[PDB]
Coordinates of C-alpha atoms and ligand atoms in Angstrom, one line a residue:
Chain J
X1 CA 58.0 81.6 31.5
X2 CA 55.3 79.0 30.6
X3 CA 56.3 75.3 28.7
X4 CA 53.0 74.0 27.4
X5 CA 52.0 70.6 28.3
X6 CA 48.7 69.2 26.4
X7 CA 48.2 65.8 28.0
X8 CA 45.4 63.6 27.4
X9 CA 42.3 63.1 30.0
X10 CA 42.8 59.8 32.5
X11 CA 46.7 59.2 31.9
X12 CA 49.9 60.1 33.6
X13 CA 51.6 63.1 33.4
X14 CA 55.2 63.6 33.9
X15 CA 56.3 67.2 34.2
X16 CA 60.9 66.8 34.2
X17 CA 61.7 69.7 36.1
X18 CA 63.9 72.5 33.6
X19 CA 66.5 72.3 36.2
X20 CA 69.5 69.8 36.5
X21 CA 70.7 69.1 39.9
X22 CA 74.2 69.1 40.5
X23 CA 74.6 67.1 43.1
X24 CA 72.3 66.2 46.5
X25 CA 69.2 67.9 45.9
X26 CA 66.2 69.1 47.5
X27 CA 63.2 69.3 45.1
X28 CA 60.1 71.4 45.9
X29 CA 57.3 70.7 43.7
X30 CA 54.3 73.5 44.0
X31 CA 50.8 74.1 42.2
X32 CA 49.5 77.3 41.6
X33 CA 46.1 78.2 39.9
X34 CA 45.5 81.7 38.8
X35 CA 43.9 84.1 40.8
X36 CA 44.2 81.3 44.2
X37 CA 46.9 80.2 46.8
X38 CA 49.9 78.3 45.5
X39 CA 49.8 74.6 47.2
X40 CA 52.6 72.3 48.1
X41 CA 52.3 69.5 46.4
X42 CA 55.5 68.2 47.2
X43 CA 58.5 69.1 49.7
X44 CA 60.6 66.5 49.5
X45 CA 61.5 64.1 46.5
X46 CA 59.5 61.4 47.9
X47 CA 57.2 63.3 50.5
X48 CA 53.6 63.9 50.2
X49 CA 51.7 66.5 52.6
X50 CA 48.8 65.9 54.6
X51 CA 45.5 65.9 52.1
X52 CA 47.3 66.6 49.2
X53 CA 46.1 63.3 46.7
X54 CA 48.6 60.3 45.8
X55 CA 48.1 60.5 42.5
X56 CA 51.1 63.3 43.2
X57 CA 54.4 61.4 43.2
X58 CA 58.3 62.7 42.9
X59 CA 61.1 61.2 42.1
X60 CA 64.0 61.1 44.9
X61 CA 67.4 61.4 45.1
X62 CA 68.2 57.6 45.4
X63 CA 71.3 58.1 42.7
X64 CA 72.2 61.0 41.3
X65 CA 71.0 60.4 37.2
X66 CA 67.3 60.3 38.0
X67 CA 65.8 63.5 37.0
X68 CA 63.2 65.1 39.0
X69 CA 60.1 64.2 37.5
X70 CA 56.5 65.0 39.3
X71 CA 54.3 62.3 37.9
X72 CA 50.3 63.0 37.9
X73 CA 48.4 59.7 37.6
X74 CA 44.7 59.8 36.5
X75 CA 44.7 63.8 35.3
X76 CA 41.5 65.5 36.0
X77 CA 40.3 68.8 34.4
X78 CA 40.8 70.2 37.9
X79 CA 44.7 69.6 37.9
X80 CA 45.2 72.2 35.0
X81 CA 47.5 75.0 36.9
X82 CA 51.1 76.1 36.7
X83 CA 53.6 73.8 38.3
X84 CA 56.7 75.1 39.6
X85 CA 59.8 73.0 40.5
X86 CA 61.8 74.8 43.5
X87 CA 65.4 73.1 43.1
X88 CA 68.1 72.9 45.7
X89 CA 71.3 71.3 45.8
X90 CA 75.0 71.5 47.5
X91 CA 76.9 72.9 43.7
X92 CA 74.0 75.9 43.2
X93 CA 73.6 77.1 46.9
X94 CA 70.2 79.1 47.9
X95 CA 68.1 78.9 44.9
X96 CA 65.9 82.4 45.1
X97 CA 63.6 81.5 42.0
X98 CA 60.8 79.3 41.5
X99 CA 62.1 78.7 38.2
X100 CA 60.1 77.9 35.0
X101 CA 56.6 77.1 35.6
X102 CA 55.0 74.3 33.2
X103 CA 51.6 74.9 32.6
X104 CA 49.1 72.1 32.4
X105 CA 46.4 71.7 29.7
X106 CA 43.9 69.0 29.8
X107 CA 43.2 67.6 26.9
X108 CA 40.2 65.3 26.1
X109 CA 37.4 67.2 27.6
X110 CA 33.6 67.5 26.6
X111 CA 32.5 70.0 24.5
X112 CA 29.6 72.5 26.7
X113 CA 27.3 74.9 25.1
X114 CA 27.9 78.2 25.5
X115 CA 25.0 79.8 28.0
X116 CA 24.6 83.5 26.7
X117 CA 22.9 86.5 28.5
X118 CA 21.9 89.7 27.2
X119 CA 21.3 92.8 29.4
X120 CA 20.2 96.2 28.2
X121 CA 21.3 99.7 29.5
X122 CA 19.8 100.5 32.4
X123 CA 17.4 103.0 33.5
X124 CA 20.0 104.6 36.0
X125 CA 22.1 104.3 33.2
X126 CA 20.5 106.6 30.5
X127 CA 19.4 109.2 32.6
X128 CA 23.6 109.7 33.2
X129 CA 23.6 110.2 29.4
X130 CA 25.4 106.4 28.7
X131 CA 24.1 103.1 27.7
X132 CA 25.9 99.8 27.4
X133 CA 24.5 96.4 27.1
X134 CA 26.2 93.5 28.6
X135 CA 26.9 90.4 26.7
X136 CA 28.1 87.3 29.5
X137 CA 28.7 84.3 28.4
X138 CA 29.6 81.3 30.4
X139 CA 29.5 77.2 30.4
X140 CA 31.6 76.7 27.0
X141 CA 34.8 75.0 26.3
X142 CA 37.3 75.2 25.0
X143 CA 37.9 79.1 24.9
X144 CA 37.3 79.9 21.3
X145 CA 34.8 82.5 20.8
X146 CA 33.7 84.8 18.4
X147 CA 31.4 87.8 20.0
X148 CA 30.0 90.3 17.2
X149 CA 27.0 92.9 17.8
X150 CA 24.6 93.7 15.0
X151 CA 22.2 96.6 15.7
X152 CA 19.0 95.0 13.6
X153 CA 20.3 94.2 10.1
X154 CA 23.5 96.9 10.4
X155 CA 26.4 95.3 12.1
X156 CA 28.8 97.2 15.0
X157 CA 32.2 97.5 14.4
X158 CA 33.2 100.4 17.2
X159 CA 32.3 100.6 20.5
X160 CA 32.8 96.7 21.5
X161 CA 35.3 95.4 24.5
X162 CA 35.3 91.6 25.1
X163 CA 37.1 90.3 28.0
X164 CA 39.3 87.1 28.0
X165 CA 38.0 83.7 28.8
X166 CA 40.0 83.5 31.7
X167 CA 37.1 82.8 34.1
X168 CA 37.3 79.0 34.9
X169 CA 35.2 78.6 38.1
X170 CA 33.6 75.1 37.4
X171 CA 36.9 74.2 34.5
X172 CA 34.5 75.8 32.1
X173 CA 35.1 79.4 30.1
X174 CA 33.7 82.4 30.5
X175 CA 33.8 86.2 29.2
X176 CA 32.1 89.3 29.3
X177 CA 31.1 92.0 26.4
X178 CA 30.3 95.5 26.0
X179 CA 28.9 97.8 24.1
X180 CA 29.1 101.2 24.7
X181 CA 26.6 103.8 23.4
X182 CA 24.5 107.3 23.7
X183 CA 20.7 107.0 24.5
X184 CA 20.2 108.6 21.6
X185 CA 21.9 105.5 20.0
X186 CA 20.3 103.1 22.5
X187 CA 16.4 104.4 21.3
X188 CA 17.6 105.1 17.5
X189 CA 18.1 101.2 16.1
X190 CA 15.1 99.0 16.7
X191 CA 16.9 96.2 18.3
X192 CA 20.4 95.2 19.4
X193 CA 21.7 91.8 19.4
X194 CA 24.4 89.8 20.6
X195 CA 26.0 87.4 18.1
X196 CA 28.4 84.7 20.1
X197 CA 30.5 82.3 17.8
X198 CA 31.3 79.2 19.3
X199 CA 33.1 76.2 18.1
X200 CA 31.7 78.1 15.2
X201 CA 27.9 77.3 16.4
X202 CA 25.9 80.8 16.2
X203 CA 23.9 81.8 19.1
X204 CA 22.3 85.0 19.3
X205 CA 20.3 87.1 21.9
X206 CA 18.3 90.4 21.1
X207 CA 17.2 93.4 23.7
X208 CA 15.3 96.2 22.8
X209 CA 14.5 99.6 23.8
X210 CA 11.1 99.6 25.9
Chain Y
X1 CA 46.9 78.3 59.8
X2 CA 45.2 80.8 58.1
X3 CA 46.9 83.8 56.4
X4 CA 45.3 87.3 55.0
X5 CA 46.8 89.9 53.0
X6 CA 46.1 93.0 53.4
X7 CA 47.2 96.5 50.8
X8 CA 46.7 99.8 49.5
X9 CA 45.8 98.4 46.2
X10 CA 47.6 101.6 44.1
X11 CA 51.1 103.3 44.8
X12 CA 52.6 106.1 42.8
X13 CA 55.5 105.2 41.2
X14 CA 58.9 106.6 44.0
X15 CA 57.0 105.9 46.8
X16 CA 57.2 103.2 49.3
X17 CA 54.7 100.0 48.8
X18 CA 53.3 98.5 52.1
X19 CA 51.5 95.3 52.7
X20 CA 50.2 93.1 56.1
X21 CA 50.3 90.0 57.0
X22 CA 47.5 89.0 59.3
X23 CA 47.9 85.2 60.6
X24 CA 45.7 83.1 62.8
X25 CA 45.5 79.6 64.1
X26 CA 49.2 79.5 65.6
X27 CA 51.7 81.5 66.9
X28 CA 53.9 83.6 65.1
X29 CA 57.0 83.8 66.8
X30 CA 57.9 80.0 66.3
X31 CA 57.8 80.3 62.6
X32 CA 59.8 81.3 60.0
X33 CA 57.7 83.7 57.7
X34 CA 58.2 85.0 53.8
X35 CA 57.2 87.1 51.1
X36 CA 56.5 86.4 47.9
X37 CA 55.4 88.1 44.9
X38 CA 53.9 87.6 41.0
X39 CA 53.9 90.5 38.2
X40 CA 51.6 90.1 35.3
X41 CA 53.4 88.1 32.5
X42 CA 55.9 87.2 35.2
X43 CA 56.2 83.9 37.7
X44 CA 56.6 83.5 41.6
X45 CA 59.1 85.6 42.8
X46 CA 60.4 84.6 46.4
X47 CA 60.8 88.3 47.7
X48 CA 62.7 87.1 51.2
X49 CA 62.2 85.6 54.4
X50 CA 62.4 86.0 58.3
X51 CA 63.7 84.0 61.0
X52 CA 62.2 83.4 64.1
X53 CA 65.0 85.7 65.8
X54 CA 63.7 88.4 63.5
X55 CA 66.9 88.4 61.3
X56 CA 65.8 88.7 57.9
X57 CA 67.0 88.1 54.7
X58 CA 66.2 89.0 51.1
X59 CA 66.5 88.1 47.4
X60 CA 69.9 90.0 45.6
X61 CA 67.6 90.7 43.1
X62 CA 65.2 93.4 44.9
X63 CA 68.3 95.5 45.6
X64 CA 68.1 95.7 49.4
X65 CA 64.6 97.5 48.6
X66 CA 62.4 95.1 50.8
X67 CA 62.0 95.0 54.8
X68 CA 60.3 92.9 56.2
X69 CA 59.5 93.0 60.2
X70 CA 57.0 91.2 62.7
X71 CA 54.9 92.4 65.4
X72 CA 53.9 89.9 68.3
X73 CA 51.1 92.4 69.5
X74 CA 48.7 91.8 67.0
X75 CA 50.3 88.6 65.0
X76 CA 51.1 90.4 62.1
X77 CA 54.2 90.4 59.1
X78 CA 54.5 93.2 57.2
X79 CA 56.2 94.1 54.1
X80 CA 57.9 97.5 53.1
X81 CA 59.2 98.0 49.8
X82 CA 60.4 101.5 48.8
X83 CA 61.0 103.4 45.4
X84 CA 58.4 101.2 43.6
X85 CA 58.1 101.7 40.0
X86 CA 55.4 100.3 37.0
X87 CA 57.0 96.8 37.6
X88 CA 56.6 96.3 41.1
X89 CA 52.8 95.5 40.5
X90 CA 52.0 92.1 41.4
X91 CA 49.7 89.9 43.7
X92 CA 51.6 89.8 47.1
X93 CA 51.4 86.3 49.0
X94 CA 52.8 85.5 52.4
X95 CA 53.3 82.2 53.6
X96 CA 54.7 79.9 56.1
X97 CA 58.5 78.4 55.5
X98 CA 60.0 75.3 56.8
X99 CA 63.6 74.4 57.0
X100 CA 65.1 70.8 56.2
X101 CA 68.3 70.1 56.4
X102 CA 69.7 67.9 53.6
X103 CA 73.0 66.1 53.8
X104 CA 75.0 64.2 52.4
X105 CA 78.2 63.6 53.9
X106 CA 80.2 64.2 57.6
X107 CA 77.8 67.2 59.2
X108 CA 81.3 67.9 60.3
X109 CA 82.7 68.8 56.4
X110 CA 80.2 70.7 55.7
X111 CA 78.7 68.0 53.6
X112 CA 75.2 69.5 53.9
X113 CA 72.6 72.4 53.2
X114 CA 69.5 73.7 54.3
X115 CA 66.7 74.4 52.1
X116 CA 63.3 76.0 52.7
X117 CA 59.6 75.1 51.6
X118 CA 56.5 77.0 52.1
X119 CA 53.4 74.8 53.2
X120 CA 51.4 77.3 54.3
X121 CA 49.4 80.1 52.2
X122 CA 47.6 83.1 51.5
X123 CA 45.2 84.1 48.6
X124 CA 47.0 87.4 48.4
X125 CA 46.9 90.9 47.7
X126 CA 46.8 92.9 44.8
X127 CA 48.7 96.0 44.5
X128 CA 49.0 98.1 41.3
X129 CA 51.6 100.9 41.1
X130 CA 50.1 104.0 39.1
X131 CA 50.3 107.5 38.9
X132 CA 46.5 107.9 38.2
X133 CA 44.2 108.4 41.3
X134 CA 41.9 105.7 42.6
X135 CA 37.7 106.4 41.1
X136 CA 34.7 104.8 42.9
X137 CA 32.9 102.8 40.9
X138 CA 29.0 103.2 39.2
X139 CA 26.8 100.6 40.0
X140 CA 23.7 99.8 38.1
X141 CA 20.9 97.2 38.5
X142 CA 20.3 94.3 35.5
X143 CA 16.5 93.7 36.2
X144 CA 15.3 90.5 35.1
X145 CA 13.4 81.2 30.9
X146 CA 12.6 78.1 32.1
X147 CA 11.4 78.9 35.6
X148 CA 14.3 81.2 36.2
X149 CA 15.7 84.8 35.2
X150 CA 18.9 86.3 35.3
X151 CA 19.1 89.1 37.9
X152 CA 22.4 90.9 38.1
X153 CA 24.4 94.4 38.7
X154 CA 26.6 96.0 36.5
X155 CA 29.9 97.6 38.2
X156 CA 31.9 100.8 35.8
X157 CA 34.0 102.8 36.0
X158 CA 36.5 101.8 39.1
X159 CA 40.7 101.8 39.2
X160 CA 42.1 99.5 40.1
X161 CA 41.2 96.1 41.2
X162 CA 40.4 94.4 44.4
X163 CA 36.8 95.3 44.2
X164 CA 34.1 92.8 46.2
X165 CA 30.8 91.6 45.3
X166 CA 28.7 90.1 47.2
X167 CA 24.7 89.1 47.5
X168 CA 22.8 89.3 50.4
X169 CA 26.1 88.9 52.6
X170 CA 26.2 84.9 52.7
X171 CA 22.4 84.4 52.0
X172 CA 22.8 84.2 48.5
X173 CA 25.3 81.6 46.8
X174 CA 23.2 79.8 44.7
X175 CA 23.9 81.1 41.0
X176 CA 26.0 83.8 42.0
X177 CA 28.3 84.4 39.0
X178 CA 31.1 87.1 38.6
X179 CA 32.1 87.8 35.4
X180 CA 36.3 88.7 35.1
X181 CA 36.3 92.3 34.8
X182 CA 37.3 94.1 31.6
X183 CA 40.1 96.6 30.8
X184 CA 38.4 99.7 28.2
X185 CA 40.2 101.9 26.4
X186 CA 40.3 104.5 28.7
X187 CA 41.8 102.5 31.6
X188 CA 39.1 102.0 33.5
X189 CA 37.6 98.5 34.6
X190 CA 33.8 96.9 34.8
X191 CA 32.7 93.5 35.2
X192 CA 29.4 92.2 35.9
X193 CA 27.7 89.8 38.3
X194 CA 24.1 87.9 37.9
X195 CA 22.5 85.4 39.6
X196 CA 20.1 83.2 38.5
X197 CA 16.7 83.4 40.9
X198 CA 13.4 81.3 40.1
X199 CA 10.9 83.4 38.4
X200 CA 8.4 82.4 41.8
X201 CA 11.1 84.4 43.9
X202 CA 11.0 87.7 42.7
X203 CA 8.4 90.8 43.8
X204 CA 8.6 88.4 47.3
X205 CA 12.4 88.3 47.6
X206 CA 14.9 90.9 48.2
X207 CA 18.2 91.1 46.5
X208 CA 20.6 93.4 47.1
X209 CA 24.1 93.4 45.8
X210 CA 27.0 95.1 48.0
X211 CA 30.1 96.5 46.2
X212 CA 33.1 97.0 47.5
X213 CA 36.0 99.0 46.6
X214 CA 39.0 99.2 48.8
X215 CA 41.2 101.6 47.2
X216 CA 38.6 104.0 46.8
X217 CA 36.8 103.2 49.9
X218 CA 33.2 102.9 48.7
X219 CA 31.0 101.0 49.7
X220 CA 27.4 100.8 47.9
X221 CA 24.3 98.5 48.5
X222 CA 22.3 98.3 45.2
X223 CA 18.9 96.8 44.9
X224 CA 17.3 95.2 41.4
X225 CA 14.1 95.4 40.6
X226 CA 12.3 94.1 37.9
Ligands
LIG1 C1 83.5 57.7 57.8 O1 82.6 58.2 58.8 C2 81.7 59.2 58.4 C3 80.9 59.7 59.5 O2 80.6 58.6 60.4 C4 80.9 58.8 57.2 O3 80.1 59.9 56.7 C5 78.8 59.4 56.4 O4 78.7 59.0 55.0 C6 77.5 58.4 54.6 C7 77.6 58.0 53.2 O5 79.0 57.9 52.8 C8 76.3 59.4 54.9 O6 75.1 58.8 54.6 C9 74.1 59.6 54.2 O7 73.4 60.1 55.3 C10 72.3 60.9 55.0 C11 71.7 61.5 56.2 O8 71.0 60.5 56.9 C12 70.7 60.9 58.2 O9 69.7 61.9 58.3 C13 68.4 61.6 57.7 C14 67.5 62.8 57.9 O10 66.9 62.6 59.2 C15 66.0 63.7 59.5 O11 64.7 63.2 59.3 C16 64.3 62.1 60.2 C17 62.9 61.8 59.9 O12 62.8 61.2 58.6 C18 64.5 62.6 61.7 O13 64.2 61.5 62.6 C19 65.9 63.1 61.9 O14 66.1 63.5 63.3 C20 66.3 64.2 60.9 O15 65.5 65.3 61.3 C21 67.8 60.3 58.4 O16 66.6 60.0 57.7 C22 68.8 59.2 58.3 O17 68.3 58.1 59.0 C23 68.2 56.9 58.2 O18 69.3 56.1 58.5 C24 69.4 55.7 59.9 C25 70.7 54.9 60.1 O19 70.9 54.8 61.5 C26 68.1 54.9 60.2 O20 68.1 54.6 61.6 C27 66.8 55.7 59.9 O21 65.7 55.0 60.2 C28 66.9 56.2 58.4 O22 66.8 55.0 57.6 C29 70.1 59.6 58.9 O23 69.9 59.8 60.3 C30 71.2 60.1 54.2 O24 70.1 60.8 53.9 C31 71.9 59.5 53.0 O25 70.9 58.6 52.4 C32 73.2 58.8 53.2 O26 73.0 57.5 53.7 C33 76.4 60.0 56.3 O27 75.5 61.1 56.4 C34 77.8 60.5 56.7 N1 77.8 60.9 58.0 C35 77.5 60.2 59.1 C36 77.6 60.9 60.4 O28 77.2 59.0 59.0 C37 81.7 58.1 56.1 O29 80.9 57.5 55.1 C38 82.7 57.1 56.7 N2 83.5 56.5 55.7 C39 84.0 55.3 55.7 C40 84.9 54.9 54.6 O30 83.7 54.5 56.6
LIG2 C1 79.5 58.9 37.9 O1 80.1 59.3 36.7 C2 79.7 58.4 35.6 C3 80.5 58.9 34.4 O2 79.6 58.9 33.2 C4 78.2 58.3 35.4 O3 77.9 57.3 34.5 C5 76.8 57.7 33.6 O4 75.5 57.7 34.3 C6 74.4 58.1 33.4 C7 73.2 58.2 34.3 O5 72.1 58.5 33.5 C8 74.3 57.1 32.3 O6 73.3 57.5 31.4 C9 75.6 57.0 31.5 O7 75.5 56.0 30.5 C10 76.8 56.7 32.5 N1 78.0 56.6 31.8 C11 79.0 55.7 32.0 C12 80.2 55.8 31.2 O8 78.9 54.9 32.9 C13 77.5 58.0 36.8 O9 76.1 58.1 36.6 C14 78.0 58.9 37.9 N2 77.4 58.6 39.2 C15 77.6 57.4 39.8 C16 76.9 57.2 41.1 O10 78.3 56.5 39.3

C-alpha cells in the first residue's frame, strides 16, 4: 500500500495523488508518521490549516485537468512520513478509504556513527537461571546494519534476536539485540562481544563475567 | 482539543473489541466525531463516524460490526466492535471531523456534495486480538566514558504492547532513550531503556525506572545501582 518516493534533500517534492477525480473534487491531503497522530496537512485544494508550514501547497480545482498534486518545497529529514490523499468528488460519491499512502524518503542526508552499548546479564537475572546481554545501538543512518556476537574467538550463531531500525526519534536509526543464554554459558566463555557492522565500518563492544 | 484513547490492549478472537474516546478542551456535543483504524502491513482505515444528533454511520466494509455511541456525562466516544478476529488488530485513533460542502452547480439540482476532513487527533490505542493470555513483564536493572555512563533497565517477558516507561516521573528527560521492543521466538516481547547520567551523579542520585503494563496491570518501580 506504500509507493516509494526517494527525493533529494532541499528541493520540491511533488506527491500526484493515485486517484483521478471525476469531476468537482474535494482533496484531503494528510501526514502520518509511524507510531504518532496523523496531521492535516491540507483540507481543501488550496487551504492550509493554522501552524501547519507553507512549504505545504495543493493544487485546486480551478479546471478540471489539473491533477492533485501536494507540493513540498525545501524537504527536511523531518518531513519523511506516509502521505495520504483523501479524494472526493460528485461521479465517486463518499469515498470510505484513505487510499494509497506514498511514503517519503529523504534522500541526501549525512552519514552518523553508530553509538553502541553493551550490557551484561544482570545479577537479578542469573539467580532466575537466564542471562542475556543487550546490544543497543542508536545515532546511525541510513539503516543498514550488520549485528554479529562472538563469544571470545568462537562466533554465536543461535540464540541472537535483533530488532528493526525502526526507531527514528531524532531522524536517526536505532535497534536493539539479544542474546540469550544459561549462567552456566554466561561464566563459561571468557568474554562476550558485540560486533555491529555499519556502512560496513566494524565496531565492537566486549562485557565480561565479574 | 485534546483527544485520548483508551483500550484493553488484547481480545480473544469472537468476542467484542471496546475502545474510549476521552476529549477535552471543547464540547462534545457540537462536533461531529469518528473512528479510525490501522492493521499492521495495512493503511488508515476510516471505521465510521457520528453526527452531532447521534445518528451514526459506518464503512460497508466492517459489515455493520462497529457501534459507535457518545456520552455527554463524562465527554467521552466510544467504540464497540464485535466478533473480532486476528485481523481486527490495529492502532485505534479517534478524531474530530468537519463537513464542507462543495458545489458546483444550482444547490437546487443537486449539483453538490458534502465531504468530511478530520483536523483533530489522537495518538491512539493499541489493541491486539489473541487467544494467549496477557504476562507481566520482568524487569531488571543495567548498572552502569567520557564523563558519563549508560544507566538503563531491561523489560522481558510481557504480551502484548502498550507497556510505559518512564524515569523519575518527569524529573528525568535528559538522555532517556527507549529502545523499540523486540518480538522472540516464543512470542514474547522486551525492549530496553537507558539513560545517559554524568559519572558525578551517581552513588548521590536516585534513579528509578517505573514500568507499566496495562494489559496485565502491573505496575513495578525498579531502582539501578551500580
Ligand atoms: C442560471 O442560474 C443558476 C443559479 O443562479 C446558475 O448556477 C450557478 O452556476 C455557476 C457556474 O455555472 C456556479 O458557480 C460555482 O459556484 C461555486 C459555489 O460558490 C459559492 O460557494 C462558495 C463556498 O462558500 C463557502 O465558504 C465561504 C468562505 O470561503 C463562506 O463565506 C460561505 O458561506 C460558504 O460556507 C463561495 O466561496 C462562493 O463565493 C465566491 O463567489 C462569490 C460571488 O458572489 C463572492 O462574493 C465570494 O467572495 C467568493 O469569491 C459562492 O458563494 C463556486 O465554488 C465555483 O467556483 C463556481 O463559481 C453556481 O454555484 C451555480 N449556482 C448559483 C446559485 O449561482 C447557472 O450558472 C445560471 N446559468 C446561466 C446560463 O445563467
Ligand atoms: C472537456 O473535454 C475535452 C476533450 O478532450 C478536454 O480537452 C483535453 O484536456 C486535456 C487536459 O489535460 C488536454 O491534455 C487535452 O489535450 C485536451 N484535448 C482536447 C482535444 O482539447 C477538456 O479538458 C475538458 N474540459 C474542459 C473544461 O474543456
Amino acid at each position: 500500500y506504500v509507493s516509494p518516493l526517494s527525493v533529494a534533500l532541499g528541493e520540491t517534492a511533488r506527491i500526484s495523488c493515485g486517484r483521478q477525480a471525476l469531476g468537482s473534487r474535494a482533496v484531503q491531503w494528510y501526514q502520518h508518521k509511524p507510531g504518532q497522530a496523523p496531521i492535516l496537512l491540507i483540507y481543501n485544494n488550496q487551504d492550509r490549516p493554522s501552524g501547519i508550514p507553507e512549504r505545504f501547497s495543493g493544487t485546486p480545482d480551478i479546471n478540471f485537468g489539473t491533477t492533485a498534486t501536494l507540493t513540498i518545497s525545501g524537504v527536511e529529514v523531518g518531513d519523511e512520513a506516509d502521505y495520504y490523499c483523501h479524494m472526493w468528488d460528485s461521479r465517486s460519491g463518499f469515498s470510505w478509504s484513505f487510499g494509497g499512502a506514498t511514503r517519503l524518503t529523504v534522500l541526501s542526508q549525512p552519514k552518523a556513527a553508530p553509538s553502541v552499548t553493551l550490557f551484561p546479564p544482570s545479577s537479578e537475572e542469573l539467580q532466575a537461571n537466564k542471562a542475556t546481554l543487550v546490544c543497543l545501538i542508536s545515532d546511525f543512518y541510513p539503516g543498514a546494519v550488520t549485528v554479529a556476537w562472538k563469544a571470545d574467538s568462537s562466533p554465536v550463531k543461535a540464540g541472537v534476536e535483533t530488532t528493526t531500525p525502526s526507531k527514528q526519534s531524532n531522524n536517526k536509526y536505532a535497534a536493539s539485540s539479544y542474546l540469550s543464554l544459561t549462567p552456566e554459558q554466561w561464566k563459561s566463555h571468557k568474554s562476550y562481544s558485540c560486533q555491529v557492522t555499519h556502512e560496513g565500518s566494524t565496531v565492537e563492544k566486549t562485557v565480561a563475567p565479574t | 482539543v485534546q483527544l485520548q484513547e483508551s483500550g484493553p490492549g488484547l481480545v480473544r478472537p469472537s468476542e467484542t473489541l471496546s475502545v474510549t474516546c476521552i476529549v477535552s478542551g471543547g464540547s462534545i456535543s457540537n462536533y461531529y466525531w469518528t473512528w479510525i483504524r490501522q492493521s499492521p502491513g495495512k493503511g488508515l482505515e476510516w471505521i465510521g463516524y457520528i453526527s452531532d444528533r447521534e445518528t451514526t454511520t459506518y464503512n460497508p466494509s466492517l459489515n455493520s460490526r462497529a457501534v459507535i455511541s457518545r456520552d455527554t456525562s463524562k465527554n467521552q466516544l466510544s467504540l464497540q466492535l464485535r466478533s473480532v478476529t486476528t485481523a481486527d488488530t490495529a492502532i485505534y485513533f479517534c478524531a474530530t471531523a468537519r463537513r464542507g460542502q462543495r458545489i458546483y452547480g444550482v444547490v437546487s439540482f443537486g449539483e453538490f456534495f458534502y465531504y468530511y476532513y478530520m483536523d483533530v487527533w489522537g495518538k491512539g490505542t493499541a489493541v491486539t486480538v489473541s487467544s494467549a493470555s496477557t504476562k507481566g513483564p520482568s524487569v531488571f536493572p543495567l548498572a552502569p566514558s567520557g564523563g558519563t555512563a549508560a544507566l538503563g533497565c531491561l523489560v522481558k517477558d510481557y504480551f502484548p504492547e502498550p507497556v510505559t516507561v518512564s524515569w523519575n516521573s518527569g524529573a528525568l528527560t535528559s538522555g532517556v532513550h527507549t529502545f523499540p521492543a523486540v518480538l522472540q521466538s516464543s512470542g514474547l516481547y522486551s525492549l530496553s531503556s537507558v539513560v545517559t547520567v554524568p559519572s558525578s551523579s551517581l552513588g548521590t542520585q536516585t534513579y528509578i525506572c517505573n514500568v507499566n503494563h496495562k494489559p496485565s496491570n502491573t505496575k513495578v518501580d525498579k531502582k539501578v545501582e551500580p
